């Protein structure tokens, strides 16, 4: 039985025609205090997988070490460690999924929601979610925390079902993700303007983008709001 | 308080009521009459919270007696039961509700018919051929379902009642020190002295 | 649930209902609450469905190992005590079982053992177990005699479940009848309360509380 | 714990420790059992090189396991006490669970089981 | 429940879903959450359904009496002040969450009221379980100087976000448009995108299937 | 919430954030937490929105009725009416209010009314969840008889830090300037104050 | 009760 | 100690072609113990029918209350109350006790004598109105009734067909609930005749 | 305090024919009022012509299905590739479930297939492993809505032969695969209308002697 | 379980034990023997938590029976009581204690004296002329204080016991379905069949 | 949890 | 407690108050909250005094045994050992530790370990109850590659404000300077820092 | 319930 | 208990 202390907020992600996009802000909250502003919550595993983690940051840093150690172990007595016997997104997910459920079943969970985004060796898009309960699900769009309430609705307008994925380009998909991050900055009280975004494409590979900022924000209409009802000045 | 039974037969209503008054690990009395006569042809047995039972019974008795004097007329068993139910229905949403459950056995002189009404402390009224309150029902209802017939005589009704008391004395955990039996018919209310 | 077993001249009579509930929801009306451990041993189930079903099936395994090891059918006493000693090890863990181990052996004769999950083990001639036990007792006790015929005893057992099936909200579905003799247990059919009630009401002239 | 396999097979297919245990039995005072039509009798030899004995308190050769079963023996006296104690405990344990005293066959089968266990358990003769 | 309010250049528009639920069960597949306080002041309600209906009708009744007394068309700020003073008196025990909108001699207005008696002002608002789905759409597409046809589209799109993504919201989209110098137009079931598909089978029973014990004619007349 | 009122040479300036939160969800990102109780007596609201609105509404009523009978009330009088409501109903109110007003005799005045219902007259006051992070900064930087431009910068820099560290605070920085000249409303957008 |  | 599920019971109402049907079980129990198999939950005030599930003392109290109110209504208006109006009266009466409510699930059914339109409505315990074209359900087997009605029901059923649909809806729902059943009553309501049928159902 | 359980909603339905069996389940996965996936299958082919679903808490559901699939694999290894009979599978699942009697799997388990006589079979389990063979069983959130409909339409309960005075019951008979799929589709459309946790898609797995076939149908997405 | 009495007289110990086994609102059995013979001249009656009572009684019985076989000798009543007390004294600080209260009535063949020991579930042992467990004591102790004499015969002891059972049947709330009486003396243990 |  | 570590041109400086409180009573007014785990690796302790002491004692043991085998450990290695204890025993520890050390390769480094057991490498870190009041001040005033005299003033002014507003903080300001030159202990008394 |  |  834990309680989370330093926490990360929404991780949002979606599939497009050739690969997957995942994004997460660079904030480590300490309750209502916005304590740490340099926190990376997207952790690449090899050149074909990115693991986005929300929830407790101490437990996130533990999972970082496990993935780092998984890459080392996979290379042992493995001449094809950078070829046919390289780590797949599906392998990395199933490992974390096993750990998360074992920890909940021992009543000592890793207080996290995790999204594993990547591209399999056969070119298939991989996107799957796992949380502190060991609950797993897959969907063309996935999000954690406030993202599930505000990002998913916007991302689902682009990719509503499976048949919409081949029709969605990386330009359209990335635009939808960057828009969702702005909406989350407006309306999530434990979000920051600064975020990281990762694209795993089956052609161009892993593109990791750091120090992005929410921009093109509408605030001008605020000047015309006076009082809460009857006040005119 | 605990055991109160009622059996409506052809021409009468029979109310059996346990005689034990227990407080803690002591049976204080073994001859208690858990009934009040509301009118010459209407009898009410009662069981529930200590103090509330008698206080409620006597309060009802006073009101029916007042009506009888005012109109020089006996209220029908149906009318009395409706009055009693409304008093309990008021009670349940009071500051301190009457925790009293009652059976009203009466003989309607206008219809020439016996009537048995079962009313709980919430004000839940039902007309029944046979009724019981508390744990008694869990034994007597299934027994009466089997053995009861609607055209039975008073003597048949008393034998059917003996069968209930025997079953309760066999399987009930607590010693209720037997029952006082009373018959309501066209000639009014009388007590069976040997049961 | 409602299960009764009683002893008489002609052996043992065992009657159960078939209703399984999850609160006020009726989950099933087609549940076998009697387990046939062997040709001369019967087990009745009340309380937790999983607990009764699992451990009475396990009891059947222990009784089989006894007759392999000892080249002799287990006594009703020994069988009942394997189950009572098992549930006693789990006492406080929250097992929920009301159980009657009914059977015949040469040394014992017809025997009934009540065994429940707080570790109570009682030999007796009459037992009713389940939410509707009091309703079954009412009819059974008031009509019970030792000198009942096999025909009358079977009916009283059936009628006592029907009585409970009617009044107890958590009992009903159908009545499963068994008769245990010196020759072993004999199954006397499944009786749907749907048809049985109206048949009994009409033929017996009882259940005058109900709108006919 | 002491683990050594003391009871093991020899080339000719004998377990010498079991056969040497029989030699200890052959050294022991004679014990005879004769069962009649409605009784069994257990006779036992007591060597007469021991005078100034106290026959009141000296362990008797025939032991009661339960009120209905007895056990006599030949061989090491100290070893017999361990078998008798285990048998007496199993006799009460059987009454407690089966609600019936042991059969002579069952009590024998148990004692025989204990003797067998010590012929393929490590660290024991 | 999903209710939104959107301001446009010459008026205000409010929209709502049509789903009523008790726990996880859908009691009403087509329910009207859009209420008339006065002819040109309309209300959308979330929270305790009974409370939103009752508080709407009470203030609506008092506003009509006030309008007759003052010989003036009622103002949105009057309905707002009377609501928030009443809700505050009951310290949140009346579970009414309202989006109040309308046109009056002063102009066009859009407010939200919470059960505890707090009020908010905005060009776009959303209340109910589907508010976060709706507000996501409003924050994405809303701009200054919306037309009538743009405001209806934005409002209905925000409700749809709730219908699809929020389990608490579903069925149809009700809209009410309050434009200055015009009668308010109530568009009951403006969108019906959740029509039940033809059933595979007719479950019309053969006559006599049900077993009957007694028949009798009931006397309804004197 | 992050609110403050600062007295300077020419009068007093009120500052506030624009963020109203239920849990971690921002219910309103353009809240006006600076409210008029009289022409040149304003207040800053923190705590329960419902409670602070109800209090502010009643005070505006009392000062309107005061003005009808006895002319313009003092800033002290306004703070006394706020205190009376807050103190007498302390068991049912979650409201931290800063009262700020401009007389021509008394000039700029600031009264703070914490949860208790106590009154404290101060040269400047800070309140709300965000205030905790700027006690150090505000103490070190505040000077008496500042100019308008100095006081606007002091409030802007202060609330900028409060907003940066407090999740509960954010949006635009609203300000209201009270001087002999009249009443001036100021707004400052994230793109400006964030990168101070 | 009912909620919407 | 959940007032709405002590006594148990169900009501269902449906609309047909120029007709309405309202049906209820007959059980009154005290939790597990069945007490009465004659407790009807459907009442009528002129041509307007009211079914009430929930705590039986409140079922009785509200019947007595609406008889009282409809009687005074008729004396003053010099006409029988209509279903639409009665619905509003039920709602007003229930919400009057907002912070001490009657633990009931009422259901109004009837045909408007002027327009000839079939009308049904359901209420929550605080008095919120649930108006429906198709059907209203209430009681301890409401989930079961919702499932039965939603699958069995079709629009514009003739009185004789509507009788079979509502009867099968109630019976099969009641058999999957412990606290419901023990007999049933179905009212078939036409413009100017009303038939009341007692159903044969399993008595467990 | 940490709560190890959750509710992922959805509902499942198993019907047994003469020479076939179906196990159907909606493809919606939810937590609280949020949709997690519109297509997340929870009806699985476990080999040896056994189909299985464990509806409720998806984590416990997947864990159980995973363990049973593994149980089938080791049965082959340990018993010379012998086919696991549906009755043997059922008893094995009882032991899996009851193994966690004091920290239960929060799931309702249904398996379907053919018995050793080649006849359709459905087995249903409580969370701690009490099990029973049936013709008919609905499981999960909307079980209370669907089950009484199945009682009426599959087992012909409360239906009497017209004109027999309610004396002769409607006779039991096996339904065709076409007639069973009609009832499944109408059960799920009805469930989708009145339950908020049910919708998005319906996936049916049909088991004949020829093997396991699949069918998919859209459901309402509100 | 509930009522267990013991009276030590001149030459014997008398144990009375109620026959009722109640669970919920049902008397399941009315012929229960709440006693085990530990040895030919030692009897133990028991009352307390369901299951624990018999499980504890039979466990003690097995251990005393084992000692009797091993040493070909009967343990004194004093020795058996000391053994039983220590088992309960261990039990009370266990994970799940035996909630069993016992009376040990025995005849010491070496001293030619009857002995009665009262031991509660905590392991509180006392030698008494007369003992009782549960609510029984609240009636019987004051009655025996008055009527008991140390030099009484077995027949006088049985009449004194009848006086206790009569008082309990009069004033106790619950029906305990009478008692099984057993006498421990120089000739061993025998049961009184008519009480 | 099923009951019996 | 009020504690901070600041990296500057020549190394790193650790700062702390001297006040240990049980309730509102000051148990020790001259506490040394700056503790040595290695020659040029020090830590700032905040939270349970029993825990922070027990943790610090174990780490000193681990780094002594590390030095015996593998020579001088990095500041990162020390922070990793602190993290391992804090994270693995998060359920039984109330400890917020700032680890600060001077390598000759890496120069000054500061790692902060909050309650969770997470590690954060920062240019400067503030922790303890007093820290809340100086987030605003420290953010606005901190610069990278400050001089020794600038960093001493920055820490002195910061902790001065923390002490002024936090009841839980007070007494003397202790500091520990870690540079290539060696280890220097500094103390500052109320009569100096109060009137800054 | 909104806060400020 | 001591805090820092
Ligand atoms: Mg029943
Ligand atoms: Mg912020
Ligand atoms: Mg039923
Ligand atoms: Mg749906
Ligand atoms: Mg004692």
* CA–CA gap between residue F187 and residue A80 (Å, rounded): 62
Query: Residue D35, exposed/middle/buried by CB under 10 A (0-12, 13-18, 19+)?
Result: exposed
Q: After which residues is chain C broken (C to N over 2.5 A)?
A: none
- Count the domains in chain F: 1
Cβ neighbours of L119 in A, within 8 Å: 61
Say how far apart CA E50 and CA H123 lie, in whole Å: 9
Q: How far apart are CA F135 and CA L164, in angstroms?
A: 10
Q: Which of these, A114, A76, A64, lies nearest to A93 by C-alpha position?
A: A114
F178 φ, ψ to 5°?
Answer: -110, 110
Neighbouring C-beta atoms of residue C200, cutoff 10 Å? 21
Assess contact for F101 and F178: CB atoms under 8 A: yes
At C7, which CATH number?
A: 3.60.20.10
DSSP letter assigned to residue H122: E
Cα–Cα distance for residue pair B67/I85, rounded to 1 Å: 78
Q: What is the CATH number of the domain that holds A9?
A: 3.60.20.10
Residue A136 and residue I39: Cβ atoms within 8 Å?
Answer: no
Yes or no: say if C152 and C7 are a contact pair by the CB < 8 Å rule. no
Q: Is C77 on the interface with D (CB under 8 A)?
A: yes
The β-bridge relationship of strands A205-213 and A194-201 is: antiparallel
Q: Centre a 10 Å sphere on the Cβ of residue E218 and count the other Cβ atoms it contains.
A: 14
Residue B91: CATH number of its domain? 3.60.20.10
Question: What is the Cβ-side half-sphere exposure of residue L37, based on CA atoms within 13 angstroms?
Answer: 35
C-alpha neighbours within 13 Å on the C-beta side of residue B32: 23
Pick the CATH number of I1-222 from 1.10.10.10, 3.40.50.11900, 3.60.20.10, 1.10.3720.10: 3.60.20.10
Closest CA relative to residue C26, chosen from H152, I148, I110, I14: I148
Residue H70 neighbours by CB under 8 Å, 6+ apart: H45, H46, H48, H81, H86, H89
Q: Cβ of I98 and C54 within 8 Å? A: yes
Helix or strand (DSSP H, E) at L60: helix L49-70
- Asked if residue L93 lies in contact with residue L120, where contact means CB atoms within 8 angstroms, the answer is no
Count how many pairs of residues, chain C against chain E, have C-beta atoms within 8 Å.
Answer: 3
Show the beta-strand stretches assigned E in L17-94: 20-22, 25-28, 34-38, 41-47
How far apart (Å, rounded) are the C-alpha atoms in residues A21 and A117?
A: 7
Sequence-distant (≥ 6) Cβ neighbours of residue L172 within 8 angstroms:
L17, L18, L30, L187, L188, L189, L190
A89 and A119 in contact (C-beta within 8 Å)? yes
For residues I95-129, one letter each, b for 16 or more C-beta atoms within 10 angstroms of the residue's C-beta and e for the rest, the string is ebbbebbeebbbbbbbbbbbeeeeebbbbbbbbbb
User: Which subunits have 3 or more CB–CB pairs within 8 Å of chain F?
Assistant: A, E, L, M
Q: Which domains does chain H have, with CATH numbers?
A: 1-204 (3.60.20.10)
CA distances from L184 to H26, L3, L178 (A): 91, 17, 7
- Enter the DSSP assignment of F145: T
Ligand nearest the Cα atom of residue C163: 1
Q: How far is CA I99 from the centre of its chain?
A: 22
Rounded to an integer, what distance in angstroms lies between the CA atom of residue B45 and that of residue J177?
28
**């027999």: which residue's tokens?**
I164
Residues 6+ apart with CB under 8 A from C71: none
CA distances from I205 to F44, I14, I109, I185, I187 (A): 64, 10, 15, 13, 16
Length of chain M as a residue count: 4
Q: E106 by DSSP, 3-state: which?
A: coil
- Name the helix (H) or strand (E) containing I58: helix I58-78
How far apart CA J176 and CA A8 sit, in angstroms, is 67
- Going across the sheet that includes H19-25, the strands are E212-218, H193-199, H184-190, H19-25, H10-16, H135-139
> Residue C198's closest CA among C207, C189, C209, C187?
C207
- Residues F40 and E129: beta-carbon distance below 8 Å: no
Q: C70 contacts in D (CB within 8 Å)? A: 106
Measured CA to CA, the distance from residue C203 to residue F140 in angstroms comes to 100
Least Cα distance to F165 among A190, A58, A186 occurs for: A190
> What residue segments make up the domains of chain I, in order of their start?
1-222
Report CA Rg, chain D: 17
Q: How many CB atoms lie within 10 A of CB A70?
A: 17
| CATH code of the domain containing E191 | 3.60.20.10
DSSP result, L152-168:
HHHHHHHHHHHHHH-TT
Whole-number Cα distances in Å, I73 to A215, E170, L124: 55, 44, 58
Measured distance CA(J148)–CA(J7) in Å, rounded: 9
Length in residues, chain F: 196
Q: Give the whole-angstrom CA distance, residue C40 versus residue L119.
A: 70
**A62: Cβ contacts below 8 Å, ≥ 6 apart:** A110, L87
Q: Does the beta-carbon distance from F32 to E121 stay under 8 Å?
A: yes
Q: What residues are paired with C3 via a beta bridge?
A: C16, C129
Q: Supply the residues of A annotated as catalytic.
A: 1
CA distance H124 to E20: 11
Q: Give the integer Cα–Cα distance in Å for C194 and I158.
A: 9
- How many of the other CB atoms lie within 10 Å of CB of H75? 8
Q: How many structural domains comprise chain C?
A: 1
E31: β partners: none
Helix (H) or strand (E) holding C11: strand C11-16
Any residues with CB less than 8 A from the CB of I44 and at least 6 apart, and which?
A: I51, I52, I53, I65, I69
Cα torsion C67, C71, C76, C82: sign? negative
For C178, list phi and psi in degrees, rounded to 5: -135, 145
Q: Give J104-161 as a DSSP string.
A: EEEEETTTTEEEEEEE-TT--EEE-SEEEEGGGHHHHHHHHHHH--TT--HHHHHHHH
CATH of the domain at F69: 3.60.20.10
Cα–Cα distance, E49 to H126 (Å, whole number) = 9
Domain encompassing residue L186: 1-196
Angle formed by the axes of helices H142-152 and H159-174, nearest 10°:
140
Taking the C-alpha atoms of residue J93 and residue A60, their distance in angstroms, rounded to an integer, is 44
3-state secondary structure of E208: coil
Q: Are B149 and J149 in contact (CB under 8 A)?
A: no
Residue A221 to residue A223: CA distance in whole angstroms: 6
Find the domain containing B167 and state its range: 1-195
Collapsing DSSP to helix, strand or coil, B101 comes out as: strand
- Radius of gyration, alpha carbons of chain M: 4
Of F121, F99, F140, F103, which is closest to residue F4 (Cα–Cα)?
F99
Asked whether the beta carbons of H175 and H149 are under 8 A apart, the reply is no
Q: In a 3-state reduction of DSSP, which class is residue H128? A: coil
Q: How far is F94 from chain L (nearest CA, A)?
A: 22
Q: Which domain holds residue E22?
A: 1-222
- Are the C-beta atoms of residues J131 and J101 closer than 8 Å to each other? no
Q: Are J100 and J53 in contact (CB under 8 A)?
A: yes
Q: Into how many domains does chain B fold?
A: 1
Q: Name the residue with tokens 């094809």.
A: A80
Q: Are H105 and H54 in contact (CB under 8 A)?
A: yes
What domain range includes position A219? 1-233
- Quick one: chain I helix, strand, coil %, rounded to 5? 30, 30, 40
Pairwise CA distance, residues A159 & A138, whole Å: 14
The CA–CA distances, whole Å, from E176 to E14, E102, F86 equal 5, 10, 41
Q: How many Cβ atoms from other residues are within 10 Å of residue L178's Cβ?
A: 27
Query: Which residues on adjacent β-strands are paired with residue B127?
Result: B117
Determine phi and psi for B146, rounding to 5 degrees: -75, -60
Q: What was the experiment behind these coordinates?
A: X-ray
DSSP secondary structure letters along chain A = -----EEE--EEEEE-SSEEEEEEE--EEETTEEEES----EEE-TTSEEEEEEEEHHHHHHHHHHHHHHHHHHHTT-TTTTTTTSPPHHHHHHHHHHHHHHHHHTT----EEEEEEEE-TTS-EEEEEEETT--EEE-SEEE-TTHHHHHHHHHHTT-SSGGGTTT--HHHHHHHHHHHHHHHHHHBTT--SEEEEEEEETTTEEEEEEEEE--S---GGGGG--SSSS---
Residue A131 near residue A24 (C-beta atoms within 8 A): no
Instruction: Give the best residue of B137, B138, B142, B148 to mutate against chain C (max C CB count within 10 A).
Output: B142
For residue F187, give both structure tokens.
């707004």
Using the beta-carbon criterion (under 8 Å), do B89 and H55 form an inter-chain contact? no
Residue H190 Cα distances to B122, E214, H70, H131, angstroms: 37, 19, 21, 20
**H/E/C letters for each residue in E123-150?**
CEEEECCCHHHHHHHHHHHCCCCCCHHH
**Taking ligand 1, which is a single-atom ion, which protein residues have CB atoms under 5 Å away?**
C 169, 172; H 204
SS3 of residue H48 by DSSP: strand
Q: Residues A99, A110: contact at Cβ < 8 Å?
A: yes
C92: left (phi over 0), alpha (psi -120 to 50) or beta: left
Residue H166 has a CB neighbour count (10 Å cut-off) of: 30
For A1, name the nearest residue in chain L, comparing CA atoms only.
Answer: L91
Q: Which residues of E touch C212 (CB under 8 A)?
A: 213
- Entry resolution (Å): 3.0
- Residues of E with Cβ-Cβ distance to F31 under 8 angstroms: 120
| E-contacting residues in M 1-4 (Cβ below 8 Å) | 1-2
Q: For tokens 């009211």, what's the residue?
A: H50
User: Which active-site residues of F does the annotation give?
Assistant: 1
Residues F98 and F108: their CA atoms lie apart, in Å, by 13
CB-CB contact of H140 with C24 (8 Å): yes
Give the bridge partners for F183, in sequence order. Answer: F178
Tokens matching residue L180: 């290539």
Handedness of CA C134, C138, C140, C141 (dihedral sign): positive
β strands within H32-177, DSSP E: 33-36, 42-45, 48-54, 104-111, 118-123, 129-131, 135-139
- How many angstroms separate the CA atoms of F94 and H36, rounded? 54
Measured between alpha carbons, how far is E21 from E29 in angstroms, rounded to an integer? Answer: 9
Burial class (CB within 10 angstroms; exposed 0-12, middle 13-18, buried 19+) of D10: exposed
Q: What is the I200 CA–ligand 4 centroid distance (Å)?
A: 8
I89 alpha-carbon distance from chain centroid: 15
Question: How far is C-alpha L152 from the chain's CA centre?
Answer: 14
Pair of tokens at residue J176: 């305990």
Residue with token string 């036990």? C133
Q: Are I200 and I35 in contact (CB under 8 A)?
A: yes
- Using the beta-carbon criterion (under 8 Å), do D99 and C78 form an inter-chain contact? yes
Give residue for tokens 């993935």. A67
Structural domain of C53: 1-212
Tell me, yes or no, if C65 comes closer than 8 A to chain K by beta carbon: no
């Amino acid at each position: 039985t834990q309680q989370p202390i330093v926490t990360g907020t929404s991780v949002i992600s979606m599939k497009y025609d050739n690969g997957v996009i995942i994004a997460a802000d660079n904030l480590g909250s300490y309750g209502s205090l916005l304590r740490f502003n340099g926190v990376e919550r997207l952790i690449p595993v090899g050149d074909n997988t990115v693991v986005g983690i929300s929830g407790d940051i101490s437990d996130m840093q533990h999972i970082e070490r496990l993935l780092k150690d998984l890459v080392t172990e996979n290379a042992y007595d493995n001449p094809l460690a950078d070829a046919e016997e390289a780590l797949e997104p599906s392998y990395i997910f199933e490992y974390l999924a096993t750990v998360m459920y074992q920890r909940r079943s021992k009543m000592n969970p890793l207080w996290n929601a995790i999204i594993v985004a990547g591209v399999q060796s056969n070119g298939d898009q991989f996107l799957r979610y796992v949380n502190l309960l060991g609950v797993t699900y897959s969907s063309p769009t996935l999000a954690t925390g406030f993202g599930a309430h505000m990002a998913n609705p916007l991302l689902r307008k682009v990719v509503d079902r499976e048949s919409d994925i081949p029709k969605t380009t990386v330009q359209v998909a990335e635009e939808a993700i960057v828009n969702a991050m702005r909406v989350l900055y407006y309306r999530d009280a434990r979000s920051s303007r600064n975020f990281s975004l990762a694209i795993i494409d089956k052609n161009t590979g892993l593109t990791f983008k750091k120090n992005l900022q929410v921009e093109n924000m509408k605030w001008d209409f605020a000047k015309d709001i006076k009082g809460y009802g009857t006040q005119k000045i | 308080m605990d055991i109160i039974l009622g059996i409506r037969v052809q021409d009468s209503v029979i109310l059996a009521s346990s005689k034990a008054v227990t407080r803690g690990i002591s049976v204080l009395k073994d001859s208690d009459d858990k009934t009040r006569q509301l009118s010459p042809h209407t009898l009410m047995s009662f069981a529930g919270e200590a103090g509330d039972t008698v206080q409620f019974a006597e309060y009802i008795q006073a009101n029916i007696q007042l009506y009888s004097i005012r109109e020089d007329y006996e209220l029908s068993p149906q009318a009395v039961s409706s009055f009693v139910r409304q008093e309990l229905a008021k009670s349940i949403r009071s500051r301190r509700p009457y925790q009293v459950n009652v059976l009203i056995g009466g003989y309607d002189k206008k219809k020439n018919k016996p009537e048995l009404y079962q009313i709980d402390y919430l004000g839940t009224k039902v007309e029944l051929p046979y009724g019981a309150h508390g744990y008694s029902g869990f034994y007597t209802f299934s027994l009466l379902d089997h053995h009861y017939r609607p055209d039975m005589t008073t003597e048949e009704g008393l034998d059917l009642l003996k069968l209930c008391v025997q079953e309760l004395e066999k399987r009930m955990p607590m010693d209720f020190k037997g029952v006082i039996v009373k018959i309501v018919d066209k000639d009014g209310i009388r007590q069976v002295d040997d049961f | 649930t409602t299960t009764l077993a009683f002893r008489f001249q002609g052996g043992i009579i065992v009657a159960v209902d078939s209703r399984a509930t999850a609160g006020n929801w009726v989950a099933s009306q087609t549940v076998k609450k009697v387990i046939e451990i062997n040709p001369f041993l019967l087990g009745t189930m009340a309380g937790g469905a999983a607990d009764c079903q699992f451990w009475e099936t396990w009891l059947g395994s222990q009784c089989r190992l006894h007759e392999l090891r000892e080249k002799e059918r287990i006594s009703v006493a020994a069988a009942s005590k394997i189950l009572s000693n098992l549930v006693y090890q789990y006492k406080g863990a929250g097992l929920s079982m009301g159980t009657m181990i009914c059977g015949y052996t040469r040394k014992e004769g017809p025997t009934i053992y009540y065994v429940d999950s707080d570790g109570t083990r009682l030999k007796g001639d009459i037992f009713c177990v389940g939410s509707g036990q009091t309703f079954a007792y009412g009819v059974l006790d008031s009509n019970y005699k030792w000198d009942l015929s096999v025909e009358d005893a079977l009916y009283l057992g059936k009628r006592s479940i029907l009585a409970a099936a009617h009044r107890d909200a958590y009992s009903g579905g159908s009545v499963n009848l068994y008769h245990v003799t010196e020759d072993g247990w004999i199954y006397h059919g499944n009786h749907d309360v749907g048809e049985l009630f109206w048949k009994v009401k009409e033929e017996e002239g009882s259940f005058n509380n109900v709108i006919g | 714990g002491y683990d050594r396999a003391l009871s093991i097979f020899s080339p000719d297919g004998h377990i010498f420790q079991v056969e040497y245990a029989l030699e200890a039995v052959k050294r022991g005072t004679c014990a005879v059992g004769v069962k009649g039509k409605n009784c069994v009798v257990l006779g036992c030899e007591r060597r007469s090189t021991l005078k100034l004995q106290d026959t009141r308190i000296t362990p008797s050769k025939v032991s009661k396991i339960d009120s209905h079963v007895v056990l006599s023996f030949s061989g090491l006296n100290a070893d017999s006490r361990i078998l008798i104690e285990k048998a007496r405990v199993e006799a009460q344990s059987h009454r407690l669970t089966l609600e019936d005293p042991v059969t002579v066959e069952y009590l024998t089968r148990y004692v025989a089981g204990v003797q067998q266990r010590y012929t393929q358990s490590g660290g024991v003769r | 429940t999903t209710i939104v309010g959107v301001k446009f250049n010459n008026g205000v528009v409010i929209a709502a879903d049509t789903r009523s639920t008790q726990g996880p069960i859908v009691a009403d597949k087509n329910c009207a959450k859009l209420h008339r306080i006065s002819p040109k002041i309309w209300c959308a309600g979330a929270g305790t359904a009974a409370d939103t209906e009752a508080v709407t009708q009470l203030i609506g009744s008092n506003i009509e009496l006030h309008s007759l007394y003052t010989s003036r068309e009622p103002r949105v700020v009057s309905a707002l002040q009377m609501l928030k003073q009443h809700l505050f008196k009951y310290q949140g025990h009346i579970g009414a969450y309202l989006i109040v909108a309308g046109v009056d001699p002063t102009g066009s207005h859009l407010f939200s009221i919470h059960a505890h008696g707090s009020t908010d002002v905005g060009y776009y608002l959303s209340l109910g379980s589907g508010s976060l789905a709706a507000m996501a759409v409003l924050e994405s597409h809303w701009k200054q100087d919306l037309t009538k046809e743009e405001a209806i589209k934005l409002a209905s799109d925000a409700i749809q976000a709730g219908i699809w993504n929020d389990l608490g919201s579903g069925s149809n989209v009700d809209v009410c448009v309050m434009e200055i110098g015009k009668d308010a137009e109530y568009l009951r079931n403006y969108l019906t995108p959740n029509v039940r598909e033809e059933k595979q089978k007719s479950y019309k029973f053969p006559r006599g299937t049900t077993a009957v014990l007694k028949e009798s004619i009931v006397n309804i007349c004197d | 919430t992050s609110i403050m009122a600062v007295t300077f040479k020419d009068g007093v300036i009120l500052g506030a954030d624009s963020r109203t939160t239920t849990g971690a969800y921002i219910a309103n990102r353009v809240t006006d937490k600076l409210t008029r109780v009289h022409d040149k007596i304003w207040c800053c609201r923190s705590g329960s929105a419902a409670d602070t609105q109800a209090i502010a509404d009643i005070v505006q009523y009392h000062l309107e009725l005061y003005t009808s009978q006895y002319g313009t009330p003092s800033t002290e009088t306004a703070a006394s009416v706020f205190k009376e409501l807050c103190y007498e109903n302390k068991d049912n109110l979650t409201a931290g209010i800063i009262v700020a007003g401009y007389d021509d005799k008394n000039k700029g005045e600031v009264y703070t009314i914490p949860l208790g219902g106590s009154v404290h007259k101060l040269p400047y006051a800070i309140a709300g969840s965000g205030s905790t992070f700027i006690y150090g900064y505000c103490d070190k930087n505040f000077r008496e008889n500042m100019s308008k431009e100095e006081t606007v910068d002091f409030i802007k820099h202060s609330l900028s830090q409060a907003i940066k560290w407090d999740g509960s605070s954010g949006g635009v920085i609203r300000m209201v300037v009270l001087t002999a000249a009249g009443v001036e409303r100021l707004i400052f957008y994230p793109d400006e104050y964030e990168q101070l | 009760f009912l909620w919407x | 100690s959940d007032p709405s599920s002590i006594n148990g019971g169900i009501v269902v109402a449906m609309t047909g072609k120029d007709c309405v049907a309202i049906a209820c079980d007959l059980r009154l129990g005290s939790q597990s113990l069945g007490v009465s198999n004659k407790f009807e939950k459907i009442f009528h005030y002129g041509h307007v029918f009211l079914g009430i599930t929930g705590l039986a003392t409140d079922v009785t109290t509200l019947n007595e209350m609406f008889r009282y109110k409809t009687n005074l209504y008729k004396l003053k208006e010099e006409r029988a109350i209509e279903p639409e109006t009665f619905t509003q009266l039920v709602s007003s009466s229930l919400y009057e006790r907002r912070f001490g409510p009657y633990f009931v699930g009422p259901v109004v059914a009837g045909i408007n004598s002027k327009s000839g339109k079939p009308f049904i409505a359901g209420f929550d315990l605080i008095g919120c109105i649930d108006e429906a074209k198709d059907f209203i359900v209430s009681g301890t087997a409401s989930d079961q009734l919702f499932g039965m009605c939603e699958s069995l029901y079709e629009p514009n059923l003739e009185p004789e067909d509507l009788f079979e649909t509502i009867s099968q809806a109630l019976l099969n729902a009641a058999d999957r609930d412990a606290l419901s059943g023990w007999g049933a009553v179905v009212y078939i309501i036409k413009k100017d005749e009303v038939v009341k049928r007692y159903l044969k159902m399993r008595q467990d | 305090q940490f709560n190890p359980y959750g509710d992922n909603g959805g509902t499942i339905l198993g019907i047994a024919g003469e020479d076939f069996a179906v196990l159907a389940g909606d493809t919606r996965n939810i937590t609280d009022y949020s949709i997690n996936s519109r297509y997340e299958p929870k009806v699985f082919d476990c080999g040896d012509n056994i189909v299985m679903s464990a509806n409720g808490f998806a984590a416990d559901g997947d864990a159980l299905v995973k363990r049973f699939k593994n149980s089938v694999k080791w049965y082959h290894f340990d018993h010379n590739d012998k086919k696991l009979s549906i009755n043997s599978a059922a008893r094995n699942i009882q032991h899996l479930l009851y193994g966690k009697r004091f920290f239960p799997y929060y799931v309702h388990t249904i398996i379907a297939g053919l018995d050793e006589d080649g006849k359709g079979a459905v087995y249903s389990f409580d969370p701690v492993g009490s099990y029973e063979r049936e013709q008919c069983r609905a499981g999960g959130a909307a079980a209370s809505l669907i089950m009484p409909f199945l009682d009426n339409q599959v087992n012909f309960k409360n239906q009497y032969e017209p004109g027999t005075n309610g004396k002769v019951k409607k006779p039991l008979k096996y339904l065709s695969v076409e007639e069973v799929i009609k009832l499944v589709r109408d059960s799920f459309t009805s469930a989708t209308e009145r339950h908020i946790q049910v919708g998005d898609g319906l996936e049916i797995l049909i088991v004949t002697k020829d093997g396991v076939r699949k069918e998919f149908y859209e459901l309402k997405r509100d």
